[PDB]
Scaffold this active site. Sequence first.
Site, mmCIF file in Angstrom:
data_model
loop_
_atom_site.group_PDB
_atom_site.id
_atom_site.type_symbol
_atom_site.label_atom_id
_atom_site.label_comp_id
_atom_site.label_asym_id
_atom_site.label_seq_id
_atom_site.Cartn_x
_atom_site.Cartn_y
_atom_site.Cartn_z
ATOM 1 N N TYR A 187 0.257 3.150 7.885
ATOM 2 C CA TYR A 187 -0.677 3.198 6.780
ATOM 3 C C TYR A 187 -0.271 4.020 5.634
ATOM 4 O O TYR A 187 0.364 5.197 5.988
ATOM 5 C CB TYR A 187 -2.191 3.515 6.808
ATOM 6 C CG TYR A 187 -3.357 3.219 6.081
ATOM 7 C CD1 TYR A 187 -3.081 1.948 5.277
ATOM 8 C CD2 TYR A 187 -4.191 4.367 4.688
ATOM 9 C CE1 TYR A 187 -3.690 1.665 4.030
ATOM 10 C CE2 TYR A 187 -4.683 3.759 3.517
ATOM 11 C CZ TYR A 187 -4.717 1.933 3.684
ATOM 12 O OH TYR A 187 -5.735 1.965 2.783
ATOM 13 N N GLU A 207 -11.816 2.324 -0.192
ATOM 14 C CA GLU A 207 -11.963 1.153 -0.896
ATOM 15 C C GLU A 207 -11.900 -0.055 0.608
ATOM 16 O O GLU A 207 -12.631 -0.982 -0.158
ATOM 17 C CB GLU A 207 -10.445 0.737 -1.674
ATOM 18 C CG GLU A 207 -9.796 -0.442 -2.472
ATOM 19 C CD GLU A 207 -9.623 -0.696 -3.060
ATOM 20 O OE1 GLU A 207 -7.962 -0.586 -2.236
ATOM 21 O OE2 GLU A 207 -9.087 -0.314 -4.194
ATOM 22 N N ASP A 224 -8.337 -2.289 5.518
ATOM 23 C CA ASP A 224 -8.236 -0.640 5.327
ATOM 24 C C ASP A 224 -8.834 0.032 5.961
ATOM 25 O O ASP A 224 -9.681 0.408 5.668
ATOM 26 C CB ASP A 224 -7.163 -1.194 3.897
ATOM 27 C CG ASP A 224 -5.607 -1.984 4.125
ATOM 28 O OD1 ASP A 224 -5.084 -2.490 5.634
ATOM 29 O OD2 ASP A 224 -5.749 -1.947 3.156
ATOM 30 N N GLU A 278 -7.722 -8.927 5.213
ATOM 31 C CA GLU A 278 -8.072 -9.452 4.079
ATOM 32 C C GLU A 278 -6.461 -9.592 3.061
ATOM 33 O O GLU A 278 -6.486 -10.047 2.374
ATOM 34 C CB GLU A 278 -8.183 -7.968 3.088
ATOM 35 C CG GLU A 278 -7.328 -6.320 3.133
ATOM 36 C CD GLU A 278 -7.707 -5.754 4.124
ATOM 37 O OE1 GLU A 278 -7.479 -6.218 5.346
ATOM 38 O OE2 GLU A 278 -7.830 -4.721 3.575
ATOM 39 N N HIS A 301 -5.542 10.636 10.022
ATOM 40 C CA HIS A 301 -4.380 10.507 9.929
ATOM 41 C C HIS A 301 -3.498 10.837 10.380
ATOM 42 O O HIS A 301 -3.045 11.996 10.414
ATOM 43 C CB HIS A 301 -4.808 10.519 8.178
ATOM 44 C CG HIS A 301 -6.251 10.032 7.505
ATOM 45 N ND1 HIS A 301 -6.674 10.978 7.610
ATOM 46 C CD2 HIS A 301 -6.487 9.586 7.147
ATOM 47 C CE1 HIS A 301 -8.292 10.420 6.788
ATOM 48 N NE2 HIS A 301 -8.009 9.240 6.638
ATOM 49 N N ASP A 358 -8.806 3.196 4.223
ATOM 50 C CA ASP A 358 -9.415 4.299 2.946
ATOM 51 C C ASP A 358 -10.978 4.025 2.790
ATOM 52 O O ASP A 358 -11.926 2.523 3.192
ATOM 53 C CB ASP A 358 -8.575 4.005 2.196
ATOM 54 C CG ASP A 358 -8.631 3.036 1.241
ATOM 55 O OD1 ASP A 358 -8.984 1.730 1.948
ATOM 56 O OD2 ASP A 358 -8.584 2.682 -0.277
ATOM 57 N N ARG A 380 -1.010 4.953 2.720
ATOM 58 C CA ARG A 380 -1.867 5.699 1.335
ATOM 59 C C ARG A 380 -2.560 7.066 2.893
ATOM 60 O O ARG A 380 -3.703 7.220 3.176
ATOM 61 C CB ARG A 380 -3.321 4.908 1.296
ATOM 62 C CG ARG A 380 -2.653 4.388 -0.242
ATOM 63 C CD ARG A 380 -4.227 3.969 -0.095
ATOM 64 N NE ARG A 380 -3.825 2.546 -1.737
ATOM 65 C CZ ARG A 380 -4.860 1.541 -1.694
ATOM 66 N NH1 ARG A 380 -6.132 1.842 -1.721
ATOM 67 N NH2 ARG A 380 -4.371 0.796 -2.776
HETATM 68 C C1 LIG Z 1 -9.698 4.815 -1.807
HETATM 69 C C2 LIG Z 1 -9.608 6.390 -1.397
HETATM 70 C C3 LIG Z 1 -9.631 7.485 -0.401
HETATM 71 N N1 LIG Z 1 -10.171 8.686 -0.398
HETATM 72 C C4 LIG Z 1 -9.715 9.185 1.100
HETATM 73 C C5 LIG Z 1 -11.108 8.441 1.744
HETATM 74 C C6 LIG Z 1 -11.125 9.018 3.224
HETATM 75 O O1 LIG Z 1 -11.326 9.892 3.557
HETATM 76 P P1 LIG Z 1 -12.692 10.480 4.221
HETATM 77 O O2 LIG Z 1 -12.860 10.096 5.618
HETATM 78 O O3 LIG Z 1 -12.983 10.921 3.616
HETATM 79 O O4 LIG Z 1 -13.531 9.311 3.352
HETATM 80 C C7 LIG Z 1 -9.320 9.414 3.296
HETATM 81 C C8 LIG Z 1 -8.667 7.340 3.886
HETATM 82 O O5 LIG Z 1 -6.638 8.013 3.566
HETATM 83 O O6 LIG Z 1 -8.919 8.700 1.117
HETATM 84 C C9 LIG Z 1 -10.415 8.933 -1.424
HETATM 85 O O7 LIG Z 1 -9.762 10.763 -1.544
HETATM 86 N N2 LIG Z 1 -9.832 8.955 -2.558
HETATM 87 C C10 LIG Z 1 -9.755 7.549 -2.459
HETATM 88 O O8 LIG Z 1 -9.683 6.688 -4.168
#
Ligand SMILES: Cc1cn([C@H]2C[C@H](OP(=O)(O)O)[C@@H](CO)O2)c(=O)[nH]c1=O
Length: 562
Positions: free
Chosen positions: A296, A92, A88, A8, A335, A90, A298
Amino acid sequence: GKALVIVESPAKAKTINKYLGSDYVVKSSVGHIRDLPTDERGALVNRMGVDPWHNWEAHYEVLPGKEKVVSELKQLAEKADHIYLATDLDREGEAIAWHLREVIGGDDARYSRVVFNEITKNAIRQAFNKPGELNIDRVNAQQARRFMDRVVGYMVSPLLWKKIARGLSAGRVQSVAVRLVVEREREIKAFVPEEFWEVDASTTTPSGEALALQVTHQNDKPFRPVNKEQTQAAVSLLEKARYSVLEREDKPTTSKPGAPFITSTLQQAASTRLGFGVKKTMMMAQRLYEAGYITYMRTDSTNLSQDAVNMVRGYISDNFGKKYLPESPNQYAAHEAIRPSDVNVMAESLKDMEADAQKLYQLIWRQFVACQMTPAKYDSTTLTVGAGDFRLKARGRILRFDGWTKVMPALREDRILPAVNKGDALTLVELTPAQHFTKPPARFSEASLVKELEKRGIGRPSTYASIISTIQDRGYVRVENRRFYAEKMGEIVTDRLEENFRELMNYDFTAQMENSLDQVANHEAEWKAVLDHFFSDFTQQLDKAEKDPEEGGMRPNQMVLT
Ligand SMILES: Cc1cn([C@H]2C[C@H](OP(=O)(O)O)[C@@H](CO)O2)c(=O)[nH]c1=O
């Protein structure tokens, strides 16, 4: 004949190209290609771009002036054999990959969704070795969140323009965040400082060395006068008493290093030690990740893979020595935490990163190395002194082994109590009474707020940052002197919402919504049924609020005359 890898950003495209062969052709989409615009009402639906009355049918559409990139991508795909979505990791990102596939089109078999938490040679390899499939459950959890946020924003705001003032905005989680700052503002405004005193003493040991003491007990009860007279009557008794060491406790203590950072902790530490605001910390961390220097940014996991643990322990023994290496690795608990990509790259070797971005890498590097080093050892000491009906204390400490603190800046450490044996006579030199004052609860900061948000299960790694910047430009709260202040309007809108949208303002309930979203991502709940339930509770509340106040509707911001 050749593969088309899509990321992206240009910056991310540059770095991932250093690890992809001739058969790969990387291309970024410089942003979001598609998204939403900008008992039912067509007027409303069209503006929202989602229809909560016809089972949430949506209306996405190519974003402003992006119609050209969509064009450039389609042609690259037809000349390609396979299409790799490397957005990425996550939710989103899983959604943005979904949009790229919807836009381009074709057969699901044409696409693969790869995943990695750092852009390095070896990490890219595994990522493209056993690719993966797009996970529709995660995409759905993300759109569920986006839709309910739209509902609140576009359907609550209009009521506010009518009841309070045009231009006001509402947020599903933003309003709950403003509520915390308002309660804190009020506790501070209602605080009554209380008076209490303390009494210190400087004495002489037998050898004649100085000893500083603090009174703790009188008549075997805690010492705490409340006025000037009480302290004086106490001080008058202490001047005549004979002083002697009642006991000496000698014990070794230790201090462990902290775990490796996570989104929450990075912000708190970047702000407390470096003076960086949340937004600044997240914009810089992202550039470091995309440039291939850190993992990463986040996350909320303190995990460390065996590879990282073995490269850092390697670094620790080469550069520090056997005594700083723990027999077995420190395990703090899919993660990883936020850590350097290669421990051997120093903050000062960072090519193309500026001053503050380097200081953030350093902060991240040090925490990572520190967390795999041994504990620091100290010799602690406590002297308890007796004087007539009083009891006094003195504490000291001496460093034995610096341990993990070796990689932190060398100390500017106050201590060393003179030598004294249980039973020796001390001579009184002077008494110093001091008046004090209870303190009112401290004011939040972009640090303590993310902290509190996490503690209550309201935030989320990928949302904390925007939550903090949102509640700021709508006039509900302001930041002056790096601290949070509640504006009048914030108290004004928070009471209104609190009276007509109890469910939406409740801390437990918005935290339970986060669990609901996780359940959809893990296939333990269906997104539409979840939106239905949220909407059912939401409209029941919104109906009551629209009525006149004598019917129990929202109170108008008016002050009726004499
Ligand atoms: C983008 C986003 C990801 N996540 C979670 C989803 C991912 O795990 P899961 O495998 O539940 O989808 C993880 C990615 O860092 O964080 C949130 O809780 N809130 C958000 O807004």
